[PDB]
Amino acid sequence: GSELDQLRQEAEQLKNQIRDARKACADATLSQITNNIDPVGRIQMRTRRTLRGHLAKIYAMHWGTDSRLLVSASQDGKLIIWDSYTTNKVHAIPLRSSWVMTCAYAPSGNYVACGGLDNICSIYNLKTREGNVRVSRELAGHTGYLSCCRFLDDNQIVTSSGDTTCALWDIETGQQTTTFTGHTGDVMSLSLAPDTRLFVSGACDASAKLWDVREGMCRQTFTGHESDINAICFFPNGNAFATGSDDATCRLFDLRADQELMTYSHDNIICGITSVSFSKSGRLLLAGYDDFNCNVWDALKADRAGVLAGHDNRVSCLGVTDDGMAVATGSWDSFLKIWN
Amino acid sequence: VQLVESGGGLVQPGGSRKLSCSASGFAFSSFGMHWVRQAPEKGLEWVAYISSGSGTIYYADTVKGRFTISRDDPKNTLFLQMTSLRSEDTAMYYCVRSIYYYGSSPFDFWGQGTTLTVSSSDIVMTQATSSVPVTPGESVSISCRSSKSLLHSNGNTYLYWFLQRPGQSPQLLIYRMSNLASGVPDRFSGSGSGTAFTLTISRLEAEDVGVYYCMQHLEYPLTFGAGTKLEL
Amino acid sequence: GCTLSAEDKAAVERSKMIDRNLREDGEKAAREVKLLLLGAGESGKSTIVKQMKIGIVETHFTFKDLHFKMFDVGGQRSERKKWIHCFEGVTAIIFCVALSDYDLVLAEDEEMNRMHESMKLFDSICNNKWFTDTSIILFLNKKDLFEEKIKKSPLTICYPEYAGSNTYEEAAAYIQCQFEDLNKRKDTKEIYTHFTCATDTKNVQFVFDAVTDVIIKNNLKDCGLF
Amino acid sequence: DWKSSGALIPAIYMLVFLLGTTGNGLVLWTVFRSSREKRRSADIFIASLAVADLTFVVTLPLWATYTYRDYDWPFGTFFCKLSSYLIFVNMYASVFCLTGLSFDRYLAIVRPVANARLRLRVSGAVATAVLWVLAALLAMPVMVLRTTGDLENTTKVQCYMDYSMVATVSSEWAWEVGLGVSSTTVGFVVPFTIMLTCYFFIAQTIAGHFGLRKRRRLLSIIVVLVVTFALCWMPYHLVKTLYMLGSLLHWPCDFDLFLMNIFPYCTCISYVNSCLNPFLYAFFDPRFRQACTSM
Amino acid sequence: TASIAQARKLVEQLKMEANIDRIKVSKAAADLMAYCEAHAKEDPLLTPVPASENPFREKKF
Ligand SMILES: CCC(CC)n1c(Cc2cccs2)nc2cc(C(=O)N[C@H](CC(=O)O)CC(C)C)ccc21
Incomplete structure (x- = not known):
């Protein structure tokens, strides 16, 4: 048969089989299990520090691996490295393109990445013999704006772009070694696994995918949202992750079961979620919102346990230190705060 | 540079x-x-x-x-x-x-x-054994002492070590009593506690001969100690 | 601080110098004009509007000791709503439309001529949430084709409910009014119109006058008098 | 006297203490309890005008009981030097805030491309730090040349500006006329000319750049500001100079009783200016009205 | 001839996704809870720590 009639119906039955298999392995909800445990009391946090000096909106930040330094990117074409203990500026790096939308910190402390609205990811060298900060490599192989970038080691980095592709690079040569394809809409974020052997991404077609870094193509696909996905993060264990979309909701997904676990929403919340982060023990889930304030969720019972108010505009960034000492939040009014 | x-x-x-x-x-x-x-x-x-x-x-x-x-x-x-x-x-x-x-x-x-040959409360750092006979392939220890404690409240210990090879200029070896400098072999090491400090060097070579100094940076003025001239 | 060590005062001084540099360079970026250059497909924006002087594409020029920055986002080809709020503080928006298009149909859809989706794009951009109080500069290019096309093929092809003299001036005025009536704010936003074609100068001057007016009105509203 | 029998002056002084305190209380409160994302180049000047006005009337009841009796003073000598200092200092601070607010508007409207740098150095916090400082340096003699003097016996003790402390006989007249004149040229005349000139160039910029509703509203507000200020502060400064000139102008008793009679009402006129000042500058802003009304 | 390459790769990707192991939700739910109770003590935000151990303690100035 020349016409493609029978092959079109093949995908319809295959989708049903996965749906049926998922239902067959749903014994009980998470609420029924974590019901008798003692709920966490009210969580009160105070603004210990307030870092100022940015003159425009702040779009991203990343914590250092020693839990003392952090980097911040703003739409005035500046990268700043802070000292959170003493509120000191260690470096100030000017950018060639001021439309930056992401930033990252090397897990060794020698390198810093950038990019956005230019299809180009720039790598900066911090430990330099002549005493300044210079751009070392300039990766350019994308056709859409850059959304996220995460360092693998001193010589590998993975980026996601708005052209529905993610790429694994080799900074020594500057050439893509693997390309991850399959997303329909633009990809907005990604999260690296604790062991750096897998990663997940969220795109504008309201879906999430789990990739394999070594071999290089998709393994599982998670659905359930009803709008764009702007934030994603990994559970500290490594067997779950959480997504934050644009329909004023957050969700928890399980890799080993391919199931919905929990939903974190309330009636008086109608704006979207811009950020998501976890706690060291994996008990507190923090999320930023467009109603100018952040929220703290008890991840085991879905109840709300606190509010982080004090920002005068949208909350766009959110991060927790490696030792769980503090929490930093950025916002569109050009102020960062540390909460303890 | x-x-x-x-x-x-x-x-x-x-x-x-x-x-x-x-x-x-x-x-x-x-x-x-x-x-x-x-x-x-x-x-x-x-x-x-x-x-x-x-x-x-x-x-x-x-x-x-x-x-x-x-x-x-x-x-x-x-x-x-x-x-x-x-x-x-x-x-x-x-x-x-x-x-x-x-x-x-x-x-x-x-x-x-x-x-420049011309025609004719301070912390005290002391060093002893100005001359020490040494042999290659062994290990030797160098000790430097201070009067006041260099341990600040933030945890830093402002003690530095330098080396002046014969006919050359001093070069940094260890800064803040624990951190190794850049471009130096892993053999060198340093340790101390509060007031008494010790520099540990093992497996010496022909390029390890010289005078070793200890300096403090707790407060100005900066005081330099004496040295120990290692001899073959 | 009276408890700081000798190596912390130097760090504090370094931070002070960093802050001074940031502040000094941040007041030079408030004395330049940022123009988001939009337009339609094959609307002649690159022919004259981007040629009148000397991913994202950026252009710089100076006219009567005033600094301009033009941002061309024609080649992006992505979801517009995910990056349209980046240009939330631009001074104005430049729009280029070819009015010799009323007879020419779209290269992909033959149902309607490209003027209709040009109007649709203008409506969508003008009534945006992020551009409530940002004025718009409107350009009507290649007017040397319009009169000789209208002397044979009249405006009835594009506008069937129009009744006029079928001459150049009346048709141009009707098109200008049709485009200007799409505004829905009428109190916080103003639209400036111009006929460009390919003429010697008279474009940078128009942009300079419009941005001077916008600056004056913005300062007047900010200082209290409104 | 006894033409003030029917003593509205104790009543008017007390009445002004009501509207002149709560009016600026709303302005002061909503400025410091609002978001900092606006910073509309004027909150510094609006706040300074409230501070220079809130204290200007906070001392009012002390002088309300003074005229209620037959010129008594049960509040001692220290207050007679401290009550007068808080009135004269804030009389110079408000008239300087209006001039500074008018010059800031000129630099931002008439030529906003050639005065961009000049508006950065001398304006804002730099200008507000010199009007407060110069105000204190000009109301210094009120602390020095103030002592509870006397009369026949001043059985009802009185507070007045003692003049024999500095100069002896045949020289105190200069400290009476010369000191008073300096409070007029710098207090009223020079600041008034600046606002007259600054608002005329702003006048021939809205007419030449504007529909017909914003062109009619903005030109009508500007004419109120230059008329209300001149109408309220003129009667006080005109009589003082009339009374001061009597030292050389041999005005008979048929007139000198008229100047002292109407002077207490002249001070009342200048006080209602402080009552409507929050309306003319701060509350005549729709984005500012919605701030305090919601809060 | 028109679209045969796109229709041949979507089926290939979706076919293998059924060839994976799935555990029960209750088993997966307990492992999520057991991780939190295991080392909940090392959480400085869940359990506030004394100010002597806080490197972000609000000093005098
Ligand atoms: C500080 C007290 C207030 C009054 C509440 N006060 C102000 C400030 C203002 C308060 C409210 C608006 S202004 N100026 C003043 C000037 C005189 C004054 O010179 N009296 C002369 C007496 C003489 O020369 O024998 C001649 C007059 C009797 C004709 C007296 C009081 C004044």
């Missing part, structure tokens, strides 16, 4: 001399600069310090009101105005760069120096 000094020579007592150094190969405008003195067959002696941006200037008690330091950012030149001299300043003057931020390592590049 490069640092070349010029302006030496003999000076009759009471006169004045001009000293300058030229920096080429690095961002000179973000690095504080020092002057360090060494008399013939004696130890090191800190002289002055000018910060980044000409904001803060310090001096030694011996030269306060008599020596002046100046910076020339556009052409990357560091000066030292030298007023009325005496028959005591006969020594060799070095130039050292230093940068201060969280995690930096000051006293990286030490320049070369220029001969």
